[PDB]
Amino acid sequence: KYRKCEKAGCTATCPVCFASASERCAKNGYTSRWYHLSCGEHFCNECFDHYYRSHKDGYDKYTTWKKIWTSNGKTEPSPKAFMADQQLPYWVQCTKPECRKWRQLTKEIQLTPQIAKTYRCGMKPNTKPETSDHCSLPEDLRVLEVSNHWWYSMLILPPLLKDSVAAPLLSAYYPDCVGMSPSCTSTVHVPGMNRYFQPFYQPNECGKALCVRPDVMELDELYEFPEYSRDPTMYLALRNLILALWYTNCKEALTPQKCIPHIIVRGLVRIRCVQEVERILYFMTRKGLINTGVLSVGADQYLLPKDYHNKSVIIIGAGPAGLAAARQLHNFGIKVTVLEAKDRIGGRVWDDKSFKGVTVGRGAQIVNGCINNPVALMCEQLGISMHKFGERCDLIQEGGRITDPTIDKRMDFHFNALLDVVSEWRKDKTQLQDVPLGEKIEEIYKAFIKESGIQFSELEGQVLQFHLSNLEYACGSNLHQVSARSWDHNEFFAQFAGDHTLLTPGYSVIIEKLAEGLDIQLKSPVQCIDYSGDEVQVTTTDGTGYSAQKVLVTVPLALLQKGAIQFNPPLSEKKMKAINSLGAGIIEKIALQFPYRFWDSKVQGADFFGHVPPSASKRGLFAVFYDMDPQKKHSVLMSVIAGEAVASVRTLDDKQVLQQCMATLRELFKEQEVPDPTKYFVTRWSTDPWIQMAYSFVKTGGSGEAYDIIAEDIQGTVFFAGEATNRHFPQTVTGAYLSGVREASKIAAF
Ligand SMILES: Cc1cc2nc3c(=O)[nH]c(=O)nc-3n(C[C@H](O)[C@H](O)[C@H](O)COP(=O)(O)OP(=O)(O)OC[C@H]3O[C@@H](n4cnc5c(N)ncnc54)[C@H](O)[C@@H]3O)c2cc1C
Ligand SMILES: [Zn+2]
Numbered sequence: 001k002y003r004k005c006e007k008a009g010c011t012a013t014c015p016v017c018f019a020s021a022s023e024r025c026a027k028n029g030y031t032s033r034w035y036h037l038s039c040g041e042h043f044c045n046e047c048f049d050h051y052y053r054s055h056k057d058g059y060d061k062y063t064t065w066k067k068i069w070t071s072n073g074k075t076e077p078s079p080k081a082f083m084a085d086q087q088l089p090y091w092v093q094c095t096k097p098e099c100r101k102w103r104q105l106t107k108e109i110q111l112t113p114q115i116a117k118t119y120r121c122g123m124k125p126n127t128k129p130e131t132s133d134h135c136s137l138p139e140d141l142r143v144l145e146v147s148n149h150w151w152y153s154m155l156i157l158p159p160l161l162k163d164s165v166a167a168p169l170l171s172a173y174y175p176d177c178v179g180m181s182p183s184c185t186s187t188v189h190v191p192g193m194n195r196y197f198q199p200f201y202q203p204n205e206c207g208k209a210l211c212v213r214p215d216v217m218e219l220d221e222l223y224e225f226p227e228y229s230r231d232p233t234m235y236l237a238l239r240n241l242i243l244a245l246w247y248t249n250c251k252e253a254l255t256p257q258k259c260i261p262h263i264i265v266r267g268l269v270r271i272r273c274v275q276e277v278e279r280i281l282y283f284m285t286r287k288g289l290i291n292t293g294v295l296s297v298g299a300d301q302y303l304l305p306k307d308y309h310n311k312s313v314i315i316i317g318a319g320p321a322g323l324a325a326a327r328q329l330h331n332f333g334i335k336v337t338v339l340e341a342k343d344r345i346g347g348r349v350w351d352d353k354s355f356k357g358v359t360v361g362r363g364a365q366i367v368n369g370c371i372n373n374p375v376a377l378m379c380e381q382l383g384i385s386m387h388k389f390g391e392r393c394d395l396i397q398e399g400g401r402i403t404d405p406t407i408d409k410r411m412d413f414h415f416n417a418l419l420d421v422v423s424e425w426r427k428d429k430t431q432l433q434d435v436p437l438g439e440k441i442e443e444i445y446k447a448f449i450k451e452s453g454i455q456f457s458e459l460e461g462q463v464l465q466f467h468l469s470n471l472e473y474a475c476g477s478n479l480h481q482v483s484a485r486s487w488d489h490n491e492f493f494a495q496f497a498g499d500h501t502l503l504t505p506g507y508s509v510i511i512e513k514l515a516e517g518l519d520i521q522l523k524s525p526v527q528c529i530d531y532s533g534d535e536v537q538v539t540t541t542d543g544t545g546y547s548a549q550k551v552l553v554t555v556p557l558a559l560l561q562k563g564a565i566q567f568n569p570p571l572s573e574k575k576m577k578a579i580n581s582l583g584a585g586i587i588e589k590i591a592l593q594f595p596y597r598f599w600d601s602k603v604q605g606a607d608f609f610g611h612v613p614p615s616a617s618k619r620g621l622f623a624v625f626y627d628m629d630p631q632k633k634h635s636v637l638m639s640v641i642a643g644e645a646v647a648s649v650r651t652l653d654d655k656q657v658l659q660q661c662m663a664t665l666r667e668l669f670k671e672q673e674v675p676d677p678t679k680y681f682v683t684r685w686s687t688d689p690w691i692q693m694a695y696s697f698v699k700t701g702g703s704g705e706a707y708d709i710i711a712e713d714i715q716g717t718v719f720f721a722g723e724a725t726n727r728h729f730p731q732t733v734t735g736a737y738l739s740g741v742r743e744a745s746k747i748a749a750f
């Protein structure tokens with residue numbers, strides 16, 4: 001007794017039963033109720049009853065299904081859910097480029113990714129027609145409707161994907177909560193021996209960098225796609241599938257064409273899903289979640305639609321951030337020029353390649369926490385290996401004695417309790433009450449000695465000094481410059497989990513790949529940035545002018561501080577306050593080649609050894625020596641000068657620094673002979689005019705917020721990236737890289 005849909009504002013002139021399950025099916029006629037799934041998809045009450053009522057013959061099928069559904073999912077197992085999960089026909093799009101018509105498949109045909117890839121109109125049960133005349137039959141008029149605004153509004157139930165590539169990573173979630181089907185027999189990390197790809201948080205898991213909640217839409221996602229606010233399921237299913245596809249093949253661009261065949265769901269909704277996967281892809285690409293790293297893009301090929309292509313950008317600095325942003329923008333199809341002061345790219349990445357059998361970094365060479373680390377992604381993309389550091393680091397004393405592990409551990413413990421008293425002391429203190437971390441530590445240690453009567457030996461004091469110099473190394477400063485309140489501010493945010501590694505082939509392999517074929521001008525030090533006009537006007541020191549709509553600054557913090565780039569309009573007081581609130585931390589490195597591996601019998605394959613400092617005054621003077629060949633075949637050691645020791649070396653030439661280091665080595669290996677080095681370098685980052693630092697840290701009275709402030713764009717035309725702009729991940733090549741990706745996403749938007 002009804003031929004119109006049950007639902008208000010349904011646009012279906014003629015509801016038709018897709019089910020035809022009952023002999024008594026209402027077909028294209030009247031029923032007591034026309035059950036709505038979509039504007040183009042209904043079933044009659046007779047067919048409803050065919051499954052739902054215990055006396056009808058479709059009851060076994062429904063009840064069986066409902067059991068599976070209930071034991072696997074958290075969604076109500078209605079007849080509608082059953083119809084959409086098990087009964088609706090599959091729709092597939094003709095892959096002939098001149099055709100592209102969507103076709104409904106006959107009730108019995110099971111869609112597979114192979115059908116999706118090869119489909120042409122008129123393809124019968126077994127997969128290609130004689131002529132392509134089947135293509136000329138008009139498209140069901142329902143197809144055109146799917147892409148309406150009000151069509152999605154009238155979906156009563158969300159799509160649930162079958163055999164999602166994401167499934168194996170979402171075992172811990174209810175499939176439906178994550179946009180997958182509770183009935184697919186399908187019911188951790190992405191496949192790989194390194195295990196570095198862990199894109200999803202486990203249920204209620206936090207504290208792991210770059211993980212995404214597979215069951216929740218973030219704010220940046222709801223803002224881009226607000227149509228999903230009532231039910232995120234569809235977005236989540238497609239975003240999750242997209243992440244899983246990207247990580248299973250990170251070496252090629254992930255396109256809609258690659259995703260289409262992996263979206264298996266019944267009904268007209270599959271069309272909506274196919275039409276959305278494109279938009280979601282573009283969002284995620286822009287954001288740098290996929291289609292990123294050192295992805296090789298064709299000259300003609302661009303990752304974003306021509307819509308984004310009417311922008312030009314000057315990027316200042318060809319370090320990791322500058323190159324990350326340049327690669328992204330260039331891949332997007334945006335016109336980018338990189339201006340670099342030095343005669344090379346890389347910035348604080350600078351690899352020496354002249355030592356036989358190893359590559360040794362003058363700057364960065366460690367990766368701290370490889371899980372979800374873009375550096376590990378780019379390593380994967382390049383098929384290069386990293387070396388995970390071993391645990392063992394003997395503290396050798398001058399004279400040759402190896403410190404007892406219990407002393408090392410006891411004084412490591414006490415070092416950490418000192419840090420805990422500091423974090424106790426500071427919780428209530430304001431910025432204006434900040435005290436140098438070094439002062440706080442010395443104070444606390446004194447009060448501990450005093451009101452406990454505990455007294456440490458000389459050796460114990462010296463081991464404590466070793467652990468102290470590690471923090472100085474980590475901060476890139478003597479602790480008397482470092483904020484007690486804020487030194488580890490970034491630790492508040494999820495950090496990168498997993499391996500700490502030596503990047504054996506060096507960061508330069510990554511840096512060079514990122515830079516490949518980009519418009520990079522070397523020895524083009526920027527002196528002036530003028531954005532007061534319609535275009536940004538950039539002028540190098542020699543006077544060459546460049547203009548673009550947008551400028552990205554990635555110069556080291558020390559260079560901003562020294563005001564090497566004139567900004568007009570000048571930077572805000574707020575920005576300058578932030579800039580000066582951060583310290584330009586410094587370490588220097590020494591590499592030493594020896595005729596043979598003299599240290600092997602004492603060190604026994606460890607990746608590094610420590611140098612117990614003879615005094616507080618010497619503590620950062622070559623505290624750790626790194627065996628630069630994890631293959632244990634070549635003989636190159638590297639060491640580090642940190643803390644007050646960096647100042648001490650400023651007046652020494654390379655040979656004296658070398659002699660100092662050899663004297664150290666001779667003392668550590670006092671009982672034996674140490675051969676002279678055949679080759680070395682000593683770095684001088686602090687007097688390198690375009691760098692003048694190693695990495696930022698928060699000065700006394702500073703805040704981690706300074707990192708966000710430096711990162712804030714001006715007027716949507718001047719953008720900042722770099723290590724010193726990454727609040728979550730300061731200091732590292734990783735953080736620098738991600739800052740550049742961050743800015744390209746900002747720049748590519750509007
Ligand atoms: C000795 C040392 C050891 C380190 N150890 C590690 C490590 O193990 N792991 C790790 O992750 N990080 C390490 N770091 C830090 C890491 O190298 C930096 O955080 C990272 O290189 C910063 O990248 P960036 O793009 O922000 O800046 P940079 O790498 O400093 O690049 C900025 C570019 O800006 C250019 N520039 C400056 N002024 C101008 C101008 N006026 N015009 C044009 N160009 C200009 C510079 O020449 C430079 O090439 C180390 C650094 C040093 C120095
Ligand atoms: Zn029916």
Ligand SMILES: [Zn+2]
Pocket residue numbers: 005006007010011012035036037038039040042
């Ligand atoms: Zn309807």
Ligand SMILES: [Zn+2]
Pocket residue numbers: 094095096099100101120121134135136
């Ligand atoms: Zn066709």
